[PDB]
Amino acid sequence: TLSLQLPWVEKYRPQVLSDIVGNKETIDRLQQIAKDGNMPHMIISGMPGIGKTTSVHCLAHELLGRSYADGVLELNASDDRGIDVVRNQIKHFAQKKLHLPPGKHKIVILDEADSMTAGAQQALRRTMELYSNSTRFAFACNQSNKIIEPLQSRCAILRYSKLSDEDVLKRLLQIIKLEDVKYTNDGLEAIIFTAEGDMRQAINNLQSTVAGHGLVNADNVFKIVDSPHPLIVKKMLLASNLEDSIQILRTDLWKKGYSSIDIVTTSFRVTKNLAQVKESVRLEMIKEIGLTHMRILEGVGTYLQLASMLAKIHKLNNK
């Protein structure tokens, strides 16, 4: 078909701050700031798909009213991460004179701010303070650690958290009711489980299920969206017997098409994040997994090395 329909993530992107479901304290604080005015400098950080860009965009829209065209400067940090940007474009926008409602000021939105280079970030330090009376900067990034500490000092540290299953279920139910989709409770629960708090993943998976099969049922959602790799990897690592681990590997990972490097990397990540196993045993399994990773990266990527790694882990656990 020549034309396409808009995705549900962008078509149903919240246009007001109330539609945002998660992080109730932060959303209420941003709504109070929007009503009262005098927006402070901030960095918004968290996981992908929990509503950081949407929150800042709704805040800017509501704060600036009809003046969003001029008062808002949109600059994807990854696209424009040079000191030249700060020297010319950001500085000229900050020195720009614009008549606004009393409380409100001009807003700079720098999405994906974690990718800004050191030079541009350091140059922004004085632009943040010199033109603060007229210009207010806003930062959105996946990881706040990439942003230098002095820049974090000048702004409010507003930190987001992974979306709870209840809020994702509420948003999914709202979209389902609005667009008349047939669903089952098991299917919605499975979509929430696969999303793992990423609302964007949940909505994309709902779109895929609806378009492909037409009914939101557990069977369809599992065929169209596979079970999360770390869970099968953890089940393989935490099996009681060696033969069980070998069987889980052969069936779920090797025969299904997962690569050796992916398997070993996910095993390392799961092992480092495991909590039931004591730290010493966890560390020695990490050692064995790292040896297997070294062999795979040197070029020996085979079922034999993965089985040997499982055998070493089981020997380590069996004392």
Binding site: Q95, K96, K97
Partner: protein, 257 residues
């Protein structure tokens, strides 16, 4: 509001080209006499004062005094956008946020309107008071620009030693040194080439090189430079216009021992 129509756009183009390499932001005070403007250099060593009277404008109309904060690079680009023979009309509305430059040619019916967003510059309108100058000097502008450009290669300092009926410029640098001596002479045949000297007291002063380059960058404005010296006060460098001038107030070096 304000509707100021220039006879020609090349005049404003050359004027803005005169002092865009020294100061980046200027406040244009548009009053019933005309547009007086002064802005401090970023190094706070040079001050540029510009006035253009109503006589320059074909039709100048102002309702209320307003401030025009502009960026020199953007203004230079906009004037570059227009042709030489157009009549440039500056139009501003109430509570100005942008300036509507109006290049228009009477020969054709082409009309080009460029809107320059007004920059918000906060600076004090420091007052300027004249004082008695020991040395008032006028030279051909081309020779002045040439000698400054020549000595600036050797060093970053220009030393103006006006001895009795003598004008000596000395530059001392790491690799070589240069000295130029100019003798006052007046020619009745060509008034432009003639050199005039007034010396109440002798003055010896040293000035920065890059500021002097930025000063002589305004050579296109006037054929004759207006140079006035005071030992403890900034030296006024003036380029005379039909209805105004381009003042340059430069700070000297420290004359240690």
């Amino acid at each position: 509001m304000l509707e100021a129509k220039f006879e020609e756009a090349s005049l404003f183009k050359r004027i803005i080209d005169g002092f865009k390499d020294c100061v980046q932001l200027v406040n244009f005070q548009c009053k019933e006499d005309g547009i007086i403007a002064q802005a401090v250099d970023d190094s706070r060593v040079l001050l540029v004062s510009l006035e253009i009277g109503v006589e320059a404008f074909q039709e100048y109309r102002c309702d209320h005094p307003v401030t025009l904060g502009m960026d020199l690079t953007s203004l230079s680009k906009i004037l570059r956008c227009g042709n030489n023979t157009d009549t440039l009309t500056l139009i501003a509305d109430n509570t100005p946020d942008s300036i509507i430059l109006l290049f228009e040619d009477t020969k054709k019916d082409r009309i080009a309107e460029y809107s320059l967003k007004l920059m918000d510059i906060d600076a004090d309108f420091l007052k300027i008071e004249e004082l008695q100058y020991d040395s008032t000097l006028s030279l051909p502008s081309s020779e002045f620009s040439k000698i400054v450009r020549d000595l600036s290669q050797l060093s970053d300092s220009i030393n103006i030693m006006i001895t009795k009926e003598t004008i000596k410029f000395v530059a001392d640098g790491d690799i070589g040194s240069g000295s130029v001596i100019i003798k006052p002479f007046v020619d009745m045949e060509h008034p432009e080439t003639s050199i005039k000297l007034e010396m109440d007291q002798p003055v010896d002063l040293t000035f920065g090189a890059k500021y002097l380059l930025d000063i002589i960058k305004g050579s296109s404005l006037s054929d004759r430079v207006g140079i006035r010296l005071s030992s403890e006060a900034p030296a006024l460098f003036q380029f005379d216009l039909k209805s105004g001038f381009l003042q340059f107030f430069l700070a000297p070096k420290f004359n240690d021992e």
